[PDB]
Structure 1
Amino acid sequence: VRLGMMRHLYVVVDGSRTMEDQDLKPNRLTCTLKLLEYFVEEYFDQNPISQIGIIVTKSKRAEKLTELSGNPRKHITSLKKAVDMTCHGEPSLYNSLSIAMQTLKHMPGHTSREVLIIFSSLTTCDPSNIYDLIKTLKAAKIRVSVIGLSAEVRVCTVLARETGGTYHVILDESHYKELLTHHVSPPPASSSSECSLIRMGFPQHTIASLSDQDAKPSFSMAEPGLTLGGYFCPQCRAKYCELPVECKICGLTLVSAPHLARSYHHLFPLDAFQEIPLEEYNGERFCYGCQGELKDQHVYVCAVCQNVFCVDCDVFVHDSLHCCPGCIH
């Protein structure tokens, strides 16, 4: 299934009073903020070309905590600040969705617009009806995948399925990581969603030519001191401290080569390995992947390389490395 390589997802978090309640081990709001930090850090770590923007809705008002950006550190910093947020009021789903729609309305067609709403308080007081907004969202091809907390509220139930997104509820804190971890992967592009080519430029890192000859002093582009060398642009010719950052002038995405290669594993998912507990003529006592003795009655094998991988190797391969070591050969 073709996926949306570049996606603009908004993580809407409810500043409802229900977040004050501590059903989980720590305060619910802190737990979401703590774990949301993992998603934000991991979201870019598995999709560099994508960008994220967080919204916090409290006291029936939806305020953009952070705009769309490609730097996880900036977003993470806002999360740390938001820990001490008052968290007093009632959320307004219409206000939150309207805010996201305005920003996402002008987004390019190629990108896969998405929204992730962390619903905590089952109540949703809104200035106007949301069904009209729901119709607008479908015409706007925005995927809203709410993640409820301790409530299978009907209003969000129609929202996820009608809009094409997915709804979920937190069975427990451990299950909470799985739900958001699932959304890290680029959701498949549906029939309605379309794709298009996107222009991009690769900023070649440059430093002083020859012992500060014809140097290129400059400070930064969004107390930055003078920099001897930094990333430039094919068109901006502006010094960018770090990548990937959208051109502040061109509007064209700048991204290094490794970043694009980071998402190739999505295109070629590794086929799952059949699990056979018995040895099954496997004469290699040591696991091929890790050269470690198999102390468990479990084995994994490919359909091409037909190698042997223990539980630890298969877990690691399908979790992080996203490729079969021996089958590369």
Structure 2
Amino acid sequence: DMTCHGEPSLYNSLSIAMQTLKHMPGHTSREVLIIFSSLTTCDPSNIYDLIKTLKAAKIRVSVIGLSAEVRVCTVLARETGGTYHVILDESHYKELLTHHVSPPPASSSSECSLIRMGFPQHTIASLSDQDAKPSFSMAHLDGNTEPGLTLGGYFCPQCRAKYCELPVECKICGLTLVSAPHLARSYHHLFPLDAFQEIPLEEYNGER
């Protein structure tokens, strides 16, 4: 229910994204998706310098335009390693979004580091036990509404930080608290299912 007015400022948005992703670790991929409705943008400074900065920072940017192809956006996507596409209809929009859901291939410059992660259980305390300590969730403290005093939950194995939501990296020690299904949730990408052989029924002399 917002108001759509003014013009896009791709330079400022890309600068904000670069500043946000400046401190991210190298092994983590930096990906930017841009939805460009208008064909023109206003930039307070040279955008090609920002393109060089993104290239040096190894940030991937992909753009899906709405009306037609933009040469500057095309160059930006090609140099940053991203893909540029154009909307044909709502179905094609969904197809492009689904295609961009899938992880992009890692370039040669992609790092390979041994990251350490913790996997706490759902520590639930029973009030009958003398060891039931209700405590407000750290994530729930971030909000304006009063945090819910939950008897148990998930506690960080590194610093005993209490969180009610997973998988979320621990804010205190920076440890990424995950669960085994979360890691296994992307295993299918590791072993994609190849397309099967198509043979019409009349040509297939076997089971019906």
TM-score (norm 2): 0.92
Find the aligned partners of 1:104 and 1:205 in 2 and give their Cα distance. 32
Q: Secondary structure at the match of 1:97?
A: helix
Give the alignment partner of residue 164 of structure 1, picking from 60, 71, 81: 81
Q: Secondary structure at the match of 1:158?
A: helix
Percentage of pairs with the same residue:
100
Cα deviation, residue 210, structure 1: 7.5
CA contact (8 A) 2:134 2:149 kept: yes
Indicate the residue corresponding to 2:29 in structure 1. Answer: 112
Give the alignment partner of residue 236 of structure 1, picking from 155, 159, 168: 159
Find the aligned partners of 2:127 and 2:149 in 1 and give their Cα distance. 18
Decide whether aligned partners of structure 1 residues 130 and 214 sit closer, same or farther in structure 2, where only a CA change above 3 A counts.
Answer: same
Indicate the residue corresponding to 2:149 in structure 1. Answer: 226
CA contact (8 A) 1:120 1:151 kept: no
CA contact (8 A) 1:104 1:113 kept: yes
Alpha-carbon displacement from aligned partner over 1:99-155 (angstroms, at most 9, x marks no partner): 000010100111111000011111011000100110111111100001111120111
Find the aligned partners of 2:87 and 2:81 in 1 and give their Cα distance. 20
CA contact (8 A) 1:209 1:215 kept: yes
CA contact (8 A) 1:110 1:198 kept: no
Decide whether aligned partners of structure 1 residues 88 and 278 sit closer, same or farther in structure 2, where only a CA change above 3 A counts.
Answer: same
CA contact (8 A) 1:111 1:195 kept: no
CA contact (8 A) 2:77 2:84 kept: yes
Find the aligned partners of 1:281 and 1:148 in 2 and give their Cα distance. 44
Find the aligned partners of 1:126 and 1:213 in 2 and give their Cα distance. 62
CA contact (8 A) 2:36 2:65 kept: yes
* 2:142 maps to 1:142: no
Counterpart mapping for 1:1-329 below 5 A: 84-208=1-125, 211-222=128-139, 223-285=146-208
CA contact (8 A) 2:126 2:151 kept: no
CA contact (8 A) 1:110 1:197 kept: no
Alpha-carbon displacement from aligned partner over 1:82-115 (angstroms, at most 9, x marks no partner): xx11111111111010000001010011111100
Cα deviation, residue 282, structure 1: 4.5
Gaps of 5+ in 1: 1-83, 286-329
Decide whether aligned partners of structure 1 residues 248 and 282 sit closer, same or farther in structure 2, where only a CA change above 3 A counts.
Answer: farther
CA contact (8 A) 1:200 1:253 kept: yes
Cα deviation, residue 216, structure 1: 2.0
Cα deviation, residue 209, structure 1: 5.6
Q: Secondary structure at the match of 2:30?
A: strand
Alpha-carbon displacement from aligned partner over 1:36-88 (angstroms, at most 9, x marks no partner): xxxxxxxxxxxxxxxxxxxxxxxxxxxxxxxxxxxxxxxxxxxxxxxx11111
Decide whether aligned partners of structure 1 residues 133 and 211 sit closer, same or farther in structure 2, where only a CA change above 3 A counts.
Answer: same
Alpha-carbon displacement from aligned partner over 1:174-226 (angstroms, at most 9, x marks no partner): 10001011111110001222222211110111112682321121121113321
Cα deviation, residue 247, structure 1: 0.7
After the TM superposition, list the runs of 4 or more consecutive aligned residues in structure 1 that deviate by more than 6 angstroms: none
Gaps of 5+ in 2: 140-145
Q: Secondary structure at the match of 2:204?
A: coil
Find the aligned partners of 1:207 and 1:182 in 2 and give their Cα distance. 40
State the number of aligned residues: 202
Find the aligned partners of 1:250 and 1:104 in 2 and give their Cα distance. 19
Decide whether aligned partners of structure 1 residues 207 and 282 sit closer, same or farther in structure 2, where only a CA change above 3 A counts.
Answer: farther
- Specify which structure has the bigger relative contact order, considering alpha-carbon pairs within 8 angstroms and separated by 6 or more residues: 1
Cα deviation, residue 283, structure 1: 3.0
Find the aligned partners of 1:259 and 1:203 in 2 and give their Cα distance. 13
Find the aligned partners of 2:151 and 2:183 in 1 and give their Cα distance. 27
The CA RMSD measured in Å over matched residues stands at 1.4
